[PDB]
Design an enzyme around this catalytic site. Structure first.
Site, PDB file in Angstrom:
ATOM      1  CG  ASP A 109       5.183 -62.498  -6.719  1.00 47.06           C
ATOM      2  OD1 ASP A 109       5.955 -63.229  -7.386  1.00 47.06           O
ATOM      3  OD2 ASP A 109       5.272 -62.347  -5.478  1.00 47.06           O
ATOM      4  CD  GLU A 113      -0.740 -64.359  -0.975  1.00 47.13           C
ATOM      5  OE1 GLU A 113      -0.918 -63.507  -1.878  1.00 47.13           O
ATOM      6  OE2 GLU A 113      -0.443 -64.024   0.195  1.00 47.13           O
ATOM      7  CD  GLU A 119      -1.710 -57.946   4.269  1.00 46.43           C
ATOM      8  OE1 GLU A 119      -2.644 -58.732   3.942  1.00 46.43           O
ATOM      9  OE2 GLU A 119      -0.916 -57.457   3.432  1.00 46.43           O
ATOM     10  CG  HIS A 144       4.070 -59.462  -3.632  1.00 49.21           C
ATOM     11  ND1 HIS A 144       3.414 -58.977  -2.519  1.00 49.21           N
ATOM     12  CD2 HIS A 144       3.548 -60.689  -3.869  1.00 49.21           C
ATOM     13  CE1 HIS A 144       2.538 -59.872  -2.100  1.00 49.21           C
ATOM     14  NE2 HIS A 144       2.600 -60.920  -2.902  1.00 49.21           N
TER      15      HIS A 144
HETATM   16  N1  SAH Z   1     -11.231 -62.343   6.851  1.00 53.12           N
HETATM   17  C1  SAH Z   1     -11.420 -62.320   5.529  1.00 53.12           C
HETATM   18  N2  SAH Z   1     -12.585 -62.799   4.970  1.00 53.12           N
HETATM   19  C2  SAH Z   1     -12.773 -62.757   3.602  1.00 53.12           C
HETATM   20  N3  SAH Z   1     -11.786 -62.251   2.785  1.00 53.12           N
HETATM   21  C3  SAH Z   1     -10.632 -61.795   3.330  1.00 53.12           C
HETATM   22  C4  SAH Z   1     -10.430 -61.819   4.703  1.00 53.12           C
HETATM   23  N4  SAH Z   1      -9.202 -61.311   4.964  1.00 53.12           N
HETATM   24  C5  SAH Z   1      -8.620 -60.961   3.780  1.00 53.12           C
HETATM   25  N5  SAH Z   1      -9.496 -61.270   2.771  1.00 53.12           N
HETATM   26  C6  SAH Z   1      -9.309 -61.042   1.344  1.00 53.12           C
HETATM   27  O1  SAH Z   1      -8.376 -61.950   0.826  1.00 53.12           O
HETATM   28  C7  SAH Z   1      -7.560 -61.326  -0.154  1.00 53.12           C
HETATM   29  C8  SAH Z   1      -6.097 -61.602   0.183  1.00 53.12           C
HETATM   30  S1  SAH Z   1      -4.933 -61.166  -1.127  1.00 53.12           S
HETATM   31  C9  SAH Z   1      -5.108 -62.729  -2.004  1.00 53.12           C
HETATM   32  C10 SAH Z   1      -5.862 -62.574  -3.327  1.00 53.12           C
HETATM   33  C11 SAH Z   1      -6.060 -63.912  -4.042  1.00 53.12           C
HETATM   34  N6  SAH Z   1      -6.546 -64.976  -3.111  1.00 53.12           N
HETATM   35  C12 SAH Z   1      -4.755 -64.356  -4.680  1.00 53.12           C
HETATM   36  O2  SAH Z   1      -4.159 -65.342  -4.263  1.00 53.12           O
HETATM   37  O3  SAH Z   1      -4.269 -63.732  -5.618  1.00 53.12           O
HETATM   38  C13 SAH Z   1      -7.901 -59.839  -0.132  1.00 53.12           C
HETATM   39  O4  SAH Z   1      -8.669 -59.520  -1.263  1.00 53.12           O
HETATM   40  C14 SAH Z   1      -8.737 -59.645   1.119  1.00 53.12           C
HETATM   41  O5  SAH Z   1      -9.748 -58.666   0.982  1.00 53.12           O
END
Ligand code: SAH
Ligand code: SAH
Ligand code: SAH
Ligand code: SAH
Lengths: 332, 331, 332, 331
Positions: A19, A111, A120, A268
């Site tokens: 994206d 993000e 989520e 997305h």
């Molecule tokens: N409570 C939590 N503690 C640690 N990681 C978490 C979390 N909740 C979600 N995540 C992680 O954060 C990611 C969010 S998607 C974002 C991916 C990356 N930061 C980017 O910007 O491209 C996922 O891999 C998920 O497993």
């Protein structure tokens, strides 16, 4: 609970990465605000691949703590090694709320946006981590707006009944299914619709709802009351509400916006539409009042309660949606 | 699994299986055409969902049908039993077949416990588990299940998947090297089974079949499933992996009726399942391609799937893992 | 009344002509029976293009009176001139029942077959013209069999409800249409279905019903009682009855058959299926009894009344069809 | 016509018009968005069929709607008025608008009286006839109607039709010469208007439009309709005939709303209508192609349609008759 399996697959990580609006804007925001980073300490909450941490490194951060809950952390670590950033980026496997950083940080980047922004429930983790922020420390993104607005889409509110009607057969292989027709209708109307749309289907200007990540507390997100009062610019049958969001990276040098609006390029996240089960007839001039109520649930999502009435007629509509099970209508 | 039973709790999911005419209609044809297997008998439906198979049972002239459903769907099934005046004869019994207690032993069990590659979802274990309520000389529907496999050539498929993984061989993505994970990307994607259909032209050898007789198999037989093969190649080309489909036979007192998911037969909601080799094997016509599929049952209710294959002539081996938890629905 | 406009267009005439099974068989029948024609007098009732008269001329007829009610007669006349048959073929514009021949004839030829054989009610004109037949004169065709049989087709009895269900929308552009759902179902079930089918959908052997054109009177065709007693060879839901027909040209030298059976090659008559509105469950062994009753109506067609019951269960089904409005399902 | 009213007496026929979203939805948009044209007014719906337009009228806030239907459909329309609690406000009035007697004069008439080529079926005469109940300053929906026509090139079409007629140029068909009627066959088929859609690329000149203002036209104006044209050719090629489509405008107090059947616009159940010349005219870019369409009304409720056209440069004339009674639905 283990939706972290989902985030373990590189393919899922790739999807976000690809994206260009999402990933490009993040990069722009950080490097265009280099002063918010040059020799500062950073917390990347949910780093996944690491991409955001790698951006913080490009902007000159001294130290970046990149926390990841899923097995995607292992690949984040492999990536920090080959890029030769072991000196500056530290991967910490686990949840933000469970791991321990060795240090308070200057800025938090993440993000954590989902469908309708809140889906989520990762924003509660984003907020949760303010416990590591140095006082007067910043957050990237800093604020989010959720927009919603009335739409008219007859064909969308019709797919719903055409589908349900499978169940209105009196003799399917000889079985009468019609007693179940009502429950089928109900199931499809509990499903938020995920695709984009021509902006002309909108009937009033959006109203926005703001969350300021610098000020908001983790528990402000269990219950989100979104009161609305629309002033219909067009006459027609209102078939539900459309939602979209914007986030804002308020830096020292500059404010960058990442917008998921029907007007901006498609991301997305698409857009989310909630149908009413009873369409409301309105005419230009009328007010469409109600509240959208978002109630956090057990399946890391939100129960949506949409109450709406047309003030002039007084005829009203109430719908309940299940955000953990949406319908992805997007094809071309 | 909590998520598995929530899945079949949605009417939309039940509708999708029902809408599959070949499936839904073959069952009906099966049941109705060997009515003697039901007329005045006691039936068990395992995971009755909407209730559809038990109704066919009622039409054949059964006397009593115990329809076990473990999802929410239990409630919707009972509504249909009332509105159809089969309260008489169809007893909806909420719960898992493992956990419930039927009041009686049954002349025949019927079920639709099949998933992709036959075994996916692992409901055949439940299906066979329910044999504990089966009387002696008691029949089963389906009776047997053939799994077919055959080598295929489809470079478009191979490139399509490969080029996805090749996102992770980039020297700098927004100035960031991902190439270190190039390896791990190929691993992951090629663990995916591609679910869609295909022209039978792409197949390169008669399929070997693996038969599981449901009348005889114990629940624990399915924990380790070892499928050996020997393909006498019939065309020279690159071998890009294996295609899997299954047939199912309702061995009745009057007639056998097949329900096939063959690429030669009419299309069903199971489509067909192809696995991909990370690197294609080269084979000449007349060559022998041999190896085994190992299917080890696991906690999480799949399926650890292993496929080793070698062109005997050249000693070109290829081993692969398959993640049934992550299919790529290419349709 | 003026369906004769329909038969005026050369395109409609062409359609029949191009049916090789129809037109070839007619030709075969006549020339393979040349003795029934050599220097005989002929009446072609409804000659249209003339094609049948031209066949009678090929077989050696002295004199052929070719009667046509539609404006297709003018083109028949033009055709007799260019073929140079003015000496042997006389076109007479008008209806058989209204015109006057100058002479009694030796043989009558005609193709008056419609859907289900009886449709269009031209067979009554065919019979009507026996008033011109020399005693012991022949008719081509001489006899017809109508066959009918039980079929199982779940998808066909389903198209019917899927269509009708348009009318089961509670809010079409805001209108509730569901009060009309019943009448919609009824309309589609009054429509005989015209296409072909795999013969395997049949559940019992046909029973035939014979009309002998040499003996039958014009009024035997206002009311056609077709009693049936089927012995089910297969178990299943019976969704209605399939009909098809055969005609027979009994000549001095030879009997030629023109068959429209599901087993023979397809003709422009296809086959006609009548759905029941209540499917009957039957099992191999059972008898399917009832009567099909064909009642001639004002719109030059037949009201079809189909009563059927399964003798073992006793459960019954009754349907009424409108043969002037069929549904042509044939596509590929 | 007895057959015309039986046609619109079938629910299936009403469903087909209703299912046309562009049509059905434009009307709704038209009515609802200029609600002032209805709010608290007296409305006439001419040939209301299912009742659909009168319901939109009710939604706009009308006070009284007289919905005239001449088919069987009258009865079904009234059922819908009851089940929707609009007995209040929608008076179904069985019969022809010419023959019935409304108790009152109306602030606005609404109708969907359009057929292929706009004029087919000839219901615009009834629509205009009903003006006798229209008050002074009374509006109409639609208000006006543009007919568009433009020359086209489509040899596939021309051959397709030609080769059908060429069945009748056979020296011996089962030993029988049909060639004498070769002429008459071409005549007949080319009298047929082809109804289907097409790529706008095939058009060879800006369309000329013919406007009929419904507020002003008398019923007898439509008896003889003379459509002159002058096409400034824009591409060299064979001219294979003319394409016809129509637009319709709901000139309201708040807004004008168009419903178009243009080949550039979204497809409707009217499709588009092309006529064919028996022999194509040859034209060069920059040339003028001129002639007239004559549409003479007739007993039998069509449409005798005449099209003469000539490429002025070369004096290449072409005259054609069109049998609207015999369309060739090529879709
Ligand atoms: N409570 C939590 N503690 C640690 N990681 C978490 C979390 N909740 C979600 N995540 C992680 O954060 C990611 C969010 S998607 C974002 C991916 C990356 N930061 C980017 O910007 O491209 C996922 O891999 C998920 O497993
Ligand atoms: N162990 C178990 N015990 C009871 N029901 C089970 C089960 N495992 C799966 N099921 C249920 O059985 C159904 C299988 S899908 C088959 C549904 C139905 N018999 C038909 O033919 O359409 C699902 O509804 C699932 O919830
Ligand atoms: N009662 C009647 N009197 C005279 N002609 C009739 C008639 N009823 C039907 N016809 C004509 O008979 C024709 C039947 S179609 C058969 C065409 C031609 N005999 C052939 O075999 O190819 C039609 O053209 C119809 O107009
Ligand atoms: N002269 C006349 N008087 C009354 N009704 C007429 C008529 N001529 C045609 N009609 C009817 O008007 C209808 C036109 S089709 C339009 C139907 C409906 N208004 C809709 O928008 O869907 C047909 O049902 C036809 O039977």
């Amino acid at each position: 609970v283990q939706y972290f399996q989902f985030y373990g697959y590189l393919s899922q990580q790739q999807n976000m990465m690809q994206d260009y609006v999402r990933t490009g804007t993040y990069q722009r925001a950080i490097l265009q605000n280099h002063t918010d980073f040059k020799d500062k300490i950073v917390l990347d909450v949910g780093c996944g691949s690491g991409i955001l941490s790698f951006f913080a490194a490009q902007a000159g951060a001294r130290k970046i703590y990149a926390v990841e809950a899923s097995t995607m952390a292992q690949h984040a670590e492999v990536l920090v090694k080959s890029n030769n950033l072991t000196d500056r980026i530290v991967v910490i496997p686990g949840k933000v709320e469970e791991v321990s950083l060795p240090e308070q940080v200057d800025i938090i980047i993440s993000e954590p946006m989902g469908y309708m922004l809140f889906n989520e429930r990762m924003l509660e983790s984003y907020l949760h981590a303010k416990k590591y922020l140095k006082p007067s420390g910043n957050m990237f993104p800093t604020i989010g707006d959720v927009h919603l607005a009335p739409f008219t889409d007859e064909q969308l509110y019709m797919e719903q009944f055409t589908k349900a009607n499978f169940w209105y057969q009196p003799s399917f292989h000889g079985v009468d299914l019609s007693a179940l027709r009502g429950a089928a209708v109900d199931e499809y109307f509990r499903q938020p619709v995920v695709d984009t749309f021509d902006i002309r289907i909108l009937m009033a200007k959006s109203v926005k709802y703001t969350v300021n990540f610098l000020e908001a507390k983790e528990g402000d997100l269990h219950r989100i009351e979104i009161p609305f009062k629309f002033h219909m610019l067009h006459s027609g049958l209102v078939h539900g509400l459309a939602f979209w969001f914007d986030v804002a990276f308020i830096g020292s040098i500059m404010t960058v916006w990442l917008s998921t609006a029907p007007t901006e390029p498609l991301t997305h996240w698409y857009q989310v539409r909630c149908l009413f089960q009873s369409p409301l007839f309105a005419k230009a001039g009328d007010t469409l009042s109600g509240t959208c109520l978002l109630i956090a649930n057990k399946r890391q999502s939100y129960d949506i309660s949409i109450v709406a009435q047309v003030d002039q007629t007084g005829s009203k509509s109430s719908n309940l949606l299940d955000l953990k099970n949406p319908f992805f209508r997007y094809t071309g």
